[PDB]
Amino acid sequence: YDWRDDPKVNKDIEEDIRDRGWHPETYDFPYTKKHDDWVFDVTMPSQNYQTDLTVNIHPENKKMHVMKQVMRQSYWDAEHDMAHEYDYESEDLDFQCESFKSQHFRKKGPISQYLILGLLPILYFGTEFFYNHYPDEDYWRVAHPPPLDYPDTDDTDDTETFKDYKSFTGRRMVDTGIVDPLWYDIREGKKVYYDWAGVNQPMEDI
Amino acid sequence: KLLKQSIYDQTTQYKLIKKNKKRGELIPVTLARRILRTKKTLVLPAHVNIT
Amino acid sequence: MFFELEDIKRRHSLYWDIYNVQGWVRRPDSTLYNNVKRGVTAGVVASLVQENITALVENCKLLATKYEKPQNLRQAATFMKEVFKLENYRKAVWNRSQYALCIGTFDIGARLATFRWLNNGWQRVFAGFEFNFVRKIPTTMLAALFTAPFSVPFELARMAYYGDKTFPKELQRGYSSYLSALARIPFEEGPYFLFKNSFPLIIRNFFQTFTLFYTYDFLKDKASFAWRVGEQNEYACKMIIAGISTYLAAVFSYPWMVTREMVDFWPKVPGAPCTFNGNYRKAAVWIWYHEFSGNYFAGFFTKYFWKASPGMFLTLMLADKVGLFDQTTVDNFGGAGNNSWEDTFV
Ligand SMILES: CCCCCCCCCCCCCCCCCC(=O)OC[C@H](COP(=O)([O-])OCC(O)COP(=O)([O-])OC[C@@H](COC(=O)CCCCCCCCCCCCCCCCC)OC(=O)CCCCCCCCCCCCCCCCC)OC(=O)CCCCCCCCCCCCCCCCC
Ligand SMILES: CCCCCCCCCCCCCCCCCC(=O)OC[C@H](COP(=O)([O-])OCC(O)COP(=O)([O-])OC[C@@H](COC(=O)CCCCCCCCCCCCCCCCC)OC(=O)CCCCCCCCCCCCCCCCC)OC(=O)CCCCCCCCCCCCCCCCC
Ligand SMILES: CCCCCCCCCCCCCCCCCC(=O)OC[C@H](COP(=O)([O-])OCC(O)COP(=O)([O-])OC[C@@H](COC(=O)CCCCCCCCCCCCCCCCC)OC(=O)CCCCCCCCCCCCCCCCC)OC(=O)CCCCCCCCCCCCCCCCC
Ligand SMILES: CCCCCCCCCCCCCCCCCC(=O)OC[C@H](COP(=O)([O-])OCC(O)COP(=O)([O-])OC[C@@H](COC(=O)CCCCCCCCCCCCCCCCC)OC(=O)CCCCCCCCCCCCCCCCC)OC(=O)CCCCCCCCCCCCCCCCC
Ligand SMILES: CCCCCCCCCCCCCCCCCC(=O)OC[C@H](COP(=O)([O-])OCC[N+](C)(C)C)OC(=O)CCCCCCCCCCCCCCCCC
Ligand SMILES: COC1=C(OC)C(=O)C(C/C=C(\C)CC/C=C(\C)CC/C=C(\C)CC/C=C(\C)CC/C=C(\C)CC/C=C(\C)CC/C=C(\C)CCC=C(C)C)=C(C)C1=O
Ligand SMILES: CCCCCCCCCCCCCCCCCC(=O)OC[C@H](COP(=O)(O)OCCN)OC(=O)CCCCCCCCCCCCCCCCC
Ligand SMILES: CCCCCCCCCCCCCCCCCC(=O)OC[C@H](COP(=O)(O)OCCN)OC(=O)CCCCCCCCCCCCCCCCC
Fold this sequence. Notes:
By secondary structure, chain A is mostly helical. Helices cover about 25% and strands about 5% of the residues of chain A. Chain B is built from 1 helix and no strands. The termini of chain B are far apart. Chain B has one helix spanning about 10-20.
């Protein structure tokens, strides 16, 4: 006996209200305990008042009783279950004994792995995309426009586009309205997008 | 429907429409043919069978 | 260098993608001052109306408990006039207006500011519907958890102020007003008097704010096809979406608030231990695992719905009007949309 394992004596053990009246350690495997039977005096009187004219039953005046929690599933005993399942190799006859207690019963165990089970879609998708960097390392990164005339003019074409917009043809096209207004300004060696362009500023070249 | 001399810059217009053309939420396929452009369209007559 | 942990700063090289949009870009309007101002304004405006409605309904119930309820339109009109001129009604309106000023400025304003801070930059798809709302889910959850406990101190101060008025003169503190009670409680009972056993209020606030803000933001964009293709009334659609959002918030929030009744108000069996040991968290867990929903959904409207839902609905409408749910949308084939213009028309 050890008081450290006794909830009554050890106040550090947090009682689970949802498991009141259920002791998994006391299960039989097979379970052969009766815990439910006829219950009266709660709403239906146990005595007889069918013909009592001076007594009228009022079910609304139900007295509150002890909460009956749903039965808790059995919890495994590691050592006992391992010993029960253990069989000696070349010392035991291959047979099934008459006793039904030899049946291998399933008992719920640790619940920590089920957290990972529940989070598996998040973990699996993170491994698939973020961990493996699929399809590439830039798709999931915060988008940044290229710097001014970077990497090459043939790709960026910021200066030529700026000159075209500032030219007569660019102004005429903007007046037509088919072409939207310019979205960046070429500052003193740097390209700055307008706040209405809805894009981040280009990353620094370092 | 007249072929007039262009006072603008055709290359500049082409580049501008390539880069920053104006689109809309409800734009018809006729005005949005991004992936439906070819050359030498096949011309057939109407109201007659062809094998 | 400064302490045991070192915040190592590292430099990186240039990187860019074909598309510069539909990701995360902080809006210029998303700032501490502007977001806080808009959130406080919307929260105060909503809370004033919510508390005025609550006071009016409670005074109507108080008058009806002593006088017969209206039988026709004329009787209803005179009943409402009498409620308006009731002495208790005016004091209740004043105190609850102060309470609304305190709440909408420190709780609803904080919720709106945090939501804007954490979700302003989620751009939407041009000529389409925003996908990948799973990306926004963490932001809304973070904001809800951060701003959940900002109302429990004010709510406990209100409860203490109202419960002090009903004690004898000897045992009555004598609070001049709700503001005076709030200013005095921290120095009399201590700061923890305004936070002890705050799990019900905290979980209620979380399940309200998260499922209101996120659901409204999701719906206002996903159901937009109604007025974008069906040519329906955008304002009517937004009103319906806000109503759905507030109803869902009330449904998801009331069960956790029911824990107060179960633990303290339900009669205790003589000689037996408390069914929940006085733990609101355990009571909430029991509610979560309970088979029958109606048992803890009883009293949903007479107790919580008309005290919480109208305020949330008004808050959603005001936030939408001011622009706390407005996102930035730009064409992905435009000048700033993408860095590859050679295949936007070819
Ligand atoms: C304040 C803010 C919050 C802070 C959070 C801090 C913690 C992190 C967050 C955790 C989640 C919190 C939210 C609640 C979730 C609900 C469950 C819960 O937490 O309930 C409380 C939980 C109750 O646990 P339970 O499982 O219900 O019952 C335990 C009883 O002892 C059962 O007694 P018994 O006698 O019946 O059985 C004995 C033994 C029986 O043991 C066996 O059966 C042995 C199994 C074969 C041997 C290999 C075991 C070790 C490898 C792990 C399993 C791999 C296979 C499964 C694949 C998925 C693994 C995740 O029990 C076990 O099964 C123990 C092993 C369980 C493994 C399952 C995974 C545990 C980790 C969960 C995620 C958190 C860590 C993430 C990083 C590491 C991931 C691995 O108690 C805890 O607080 C435990 C937390 C998890 C374990 C600690 C992990 C630390 C890792 C650090 C690095 C490695 C150091 C050690 C290695 C050696 C040195 C290098
Ligand atoms: C931003 C993060 C975003 C993350 C997003 C994540 C999204 C995905 C996951 C979402 C779900 C997450 C669930 C987490 C685990 C929940 C476990 C649970 O339910 O049981 C816990 C706990 C159960 O405890 P219990 O033993 O069963 O007692 C039951 C009692 O009825 C209630 O317990 P009690 O009455 O014994 O104590 C109530 C608590 C009341 O405390 C509070 O209200 C503080 C907020 C956190 C309380 C959380 C409980 C305590 C946890 C340990 C200590 C936390 C320290 C503060 C937070 C940082 C560290 C986490 O009292 C204290 O702990 C000490 C109060 C001291 C007096 C007040 C002084 C305040 C500071 C004033 C000066 C500094 C500020 C102003 C000046 C600044 C400089 C100028 O339940 C709660 O307290 C509420 C849980 C609600 C769960 C629903 C979701 C909302 C969660 C909100 C928590 C965080 C609020 C914001 C602060 C942190 C971010 C800044
Ligand atoms: C589409 C069908 C096609 C095939 C047709 C086949 C032939 C006809 C159908 C078969 C008969 C079904 C009879 C159902 C009504 C039963 C009586 C009644 O009024 O219900 C109260 C009754 C509880 O009353 P009680 O037992 O006195 O409560 C005492 C205790 O609290 C014990 O309560 P507890 O522990 O059971 O917990 C109850 C709690 C926990 O249970 C729940 O929360 C149920 C969650 C159900 C989710 C799935 C339904 C759809 C959710 C909305 C999705 C948006 C689009 C919806 C419309 C398009 C899709 C259908 O729920 C509540 O708090 C009340 C539930 C709401 C009742 C709704 C009243 C109208 C019922 C008549 C039909 C309405 C049809 C319109 C659509 C459904 C409107 C709700 O609820 C039930 O017994 C559960 C079923 C409730 C209705 C849902 C099932 C029918 C619809 C099936 C849809 C299948 C597609 C799902 C995917 C949709 C994806 C968009
Ligand atoms: C896409 C197609 C979709 C098709 C399906 C959906 C369409 C409907 C299908 C058919 C079912 C509905 C029709 C039959 C039932 C109708 C309702 C009914 O008879 O019960 C009345 C009942 C009122 O209480 P009561 O039963 O008369 O008891 C009075 C007692 O004296 C005192 O009450 P208490 O405090 O003791 O509490 C009693 C309470 C006990 O507490 C509860 O049981 C509450 C929880 C109920 C179950 C909740 C989950 C299931 C429903 C949601 C999921 C399925 C629908 C999804 C809809 C998607 C969007 C279309 O009793 C109930 O409410 C239970 C029965 C009625 C509700 C549940 C069964 C009907 C289904 C829900 C109908 C309402 C849907 C609203 C919108 C939902 C949006 C997601 O419920 C309502 O009146 C609620 C609905 C109306 C809310 C209006 C205001 C909402 C917005 C807030 C406004 C704030 C002020 C500002 C206004 C500004 C204006 C400009
Ligand atoms: C939901 C998260 C918790 C899950 C707990 C249960 C599962 C066990 C933990 C799985 C990993 C959790 C994510 C963080 C660590 C990722 C490490 C990794 O390989 O990623 C590199 C990868 C990419 O690394 P890489 O590409 O540079 O290289 C990886 C290695 N090679 C070279 C082989 C490819 O990065 C990511 O995928 C980004 C992950 C971001 C996660 C942000 C949220 C979590 C951060 C806070 C955690 C706080 C609690 C501590 C962690 C949980 C408890 C222990
Ligand atoms: C509505 O979305 C959700 C949240 O807010 C965003 C949540 O916070 C949460 C988290 C909340 C929890 C875990 C607590 C839940 C409540 C508990 C435990 C207390 C008990 C509650 C009950 C018994 C009631 C159960 C009710 C339900 C199952 C029904 C819930 C209804 C949901 C999810 C939505 C129903 C459908 C709609 C509103 C349709 C909306 C769609 C349109 C208008 C058209 C959109 C069109 C397109 C094309 C997308 C969830 C699960 C959620 O689904
Ligand atoms: C059913 C489940 C899957 C659901 C669909 C998910 C699709 C995307 C893949 C995500 C998988 C994990 C779940 C994360 C959901 C929330 C974050 C998210 O969705 O990230 C998207 C967003 C970046 O995307 P965005 O840049 O907007 O994309 C378009 C850009 N032009 O990023 C953000 O908003 C920033 C988020 C930062 C924190 C993310 C943490 C993720 C952790 C995942 C598990 C990692 C496990 C690693 C294991 C290592 C083992 C050694
Ligand atoms: C979007 C498709 C993918 C999502 C899933 C679809 C499931 C379909 C199941 C069949 C029953 C639902 C009805 C069909 C879907 C909704 C209507 C739709 O697809 O939108 C198209 C339609 C207008 O299309 P059309 O007339 O061709 O426009 C040409 C403009 N020159 O639009 C309209 O006329 C608007 C009609 C909107 C009806 C929405 C009903 C479902 C949403 C939940 C209930 C909303 C209740 C509140 C509605 C308030 C309206 C003010």
